[PDB]
Amino acid sequence: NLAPLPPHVPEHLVFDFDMYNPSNLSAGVQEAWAVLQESNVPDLVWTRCNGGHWIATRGQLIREAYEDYRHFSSECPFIPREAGEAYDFIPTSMDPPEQRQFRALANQVVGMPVVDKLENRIQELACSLIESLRPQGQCNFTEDYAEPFPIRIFMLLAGLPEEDIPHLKYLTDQMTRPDGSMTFAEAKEALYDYLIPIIEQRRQKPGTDAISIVANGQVNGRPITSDEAKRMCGLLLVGGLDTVVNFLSFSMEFLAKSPEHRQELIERPERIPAACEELLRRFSLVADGRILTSDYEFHGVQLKKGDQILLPQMLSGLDERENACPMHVDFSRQKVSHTTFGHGSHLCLGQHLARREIIVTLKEWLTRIPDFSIAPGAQIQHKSGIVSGVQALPLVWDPATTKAV
Ligand code: HEM
Ligand SMILES: CC1(C)[C@@H]2CC[C@@]1(C)C(=O)C2
Ligand SMILES: [K+]
């Protein structure tokens, strides 16, 4: 249902897009969001769905807003408003200047040098999973690879038992694509319930896992509090359990449907890093936003203090004003413009981990299973939310065409 239009919002800018269930979802989630960029549609629209909020539809406005933290605060970054208000993860719920000391701590646990440390175990895991699947001639890609591969890497980094995944994965999903059984506040409270005793424990007896590092850490040279450590560790869990997991399934679905693209990467595997970046553009998948700190005129539209504005990271690279023929995947694309990992001071801290996981996946999969397709008859369904994903991805191949390494 539709929230009554506020007096300040002009009627001609109303476009009732539902970020948790977009109209055109059956055509693909990126396609469904791209309807906001059809010729009829202003650069900035108001939807009455999900309590009512602005949506910037073009990369120019999305970038500008993400740069301007004085007008567009990350204190309430999720729609609906109750989710945004409850949202308190660190660093994302904080604006500069105080945000920054916390980013620096987070970088000690997910930064380039840590990923270099993880490199061999990331490869080993990719390979053990793929080799196991290779002979079977089929898989449920979401559950058999996309989920276990990035998630087990995160649980290893965090020093958490793998048997805790189904519970944590359920909770993180309720924050990004809720099935209605939990509010965001409830899911958050449960993630923190899980974390609290582990944080206390690791402050007492420090290990070398990510939770210990964060929990015993300093920010601008003063000790982090247990509450700060919990708000940072929660976010890290979310990043680990619901980002790359979804992205891998979009990419593999595309490769399953497009032999010429796989052929290109089999014939020339040096192109894989560039292909990674182009898939990160075409199959971009995050959309969160900001809250207005004051009344502010933006691109000829009056915004009011407290208005929420969705700034979909997904849309920038799909914008035909950033990338010609945006829905086409071109591994040779000369200037791959996107905001897939965000923009401004909250630029994704996990992006180095994410690119390593994706590139290792592409290399190792195509090396063993170069020819595969979607199970015949399977109608692939996407799902939309703060992070979008794929419900299920049944794949099939002829074992005879595979190669053990
Ligand atoms: C394909 C994978 C990924 C995508 C597309 C993605 C995207 C994003 C986006 C758009 C933001 C900015 C949100 C905002 O401005 O409100 C962000 C921030 C963040 N990301 Fe990622 N991310 C991914 C992977 C990961 C991973 C694997 C981790 C951790 C293991 C992670 C950790 C974080 C953290 C801690 C921040 C907050 C930075 C801040 O608020 O200063 N990311 N990411
Ligand atoms: C929007 C995000 C992808 C980014 C990292 C996890 C996530 C859901 C957040 O709350 C911040
Ligand atoms: K908040």
What does this structure look like?
The chain is of the alpha+beta class and 405 residues long. It has one domain: Cytochrome P450 (Cytochrome p450). The protein has helices at residues 29-34, 59-67, 81-86, 99-110, 112-133, 141-146, 148-158, 165-176, 184-204, 210-215, 226-242, 244-257, 259-267, 272-282, 313-318, 351-368; strands spanning 44-47, 53-56, 72-73, 138-140, 218-219, 222-223, 288-292, 296-298, 301-303, 308-311, 373-374, 382-383, 389-390, 394-396. A five-stranded mixed β-sheet has the order 1-2-10-7-3, covered by helices on one side. A hairpin with a 5-residue loop joins strand 12 (382-383) and strand 13 (389-390). It is globular and about 65 Å long. The structure holds protoporphyrin IX containing FE, camphor and potassium ion. The site of potassium ion (K) has 7 residues, from helix 3. Protoporphyrin IX containing FE is lined by residues 74, 77, 91-92, 99, 103, 106, 110, 154, 235-236, 239-240, 243-244, 247, 286, 288, 313, 340-342, 346, 348-350, 353-354.
Taken together, the total number of domains comes to: 1
Any ligands, ions or cofactors bound here, and which? protoporphyrin IX containing FE, camphor, potassium ion
Structural class: alpha+beta
**Shape summary:** globular
Per CATH, what is the topology?
A: Cytochrome p450
Strand content: 5-15%
Give the helices and strands as they follow along the chain.
HEEHEHHHEHHHHHEEHHHHEEEEHHEEEE
Largest sheet: 5 strands, mixed
Compute the gyration radius: what is it? Answer: 21 Å
* Secondary-structure arrangement, i.e. CATH architecture: Orthogonal Bundle
Strand order of the largest sheet: 1-2-10-7-3
**Alpha-carbon distance between the termini?**
54 Å
CATH class label: Mainly Alpha
Give the number of DSSP strands.
Answer: 14
Query: CATH H-level name... which superfamily?
Result: Cytochrome P450
Number of helices: 16
Family: Belongs to the cytochrome P450 family.
Catalytic activity: 2 reduced [2Fe-2S]-[putidaredoxin] + (1R,4R)-camphor + O2 + 2 H(+) = (1R,4R,5R)-5-hydroxycamphor + 2 oxidized [2Fe-2S]-[putidaredoxin] + H2O
InterPro entries: Cyt_P450 (IPR001128), Cyt_P450_B (IPR002397), Cyt_P450_CS (IPR017972), Cyt_P450_sf (IPR036396)
Pfam families: p450
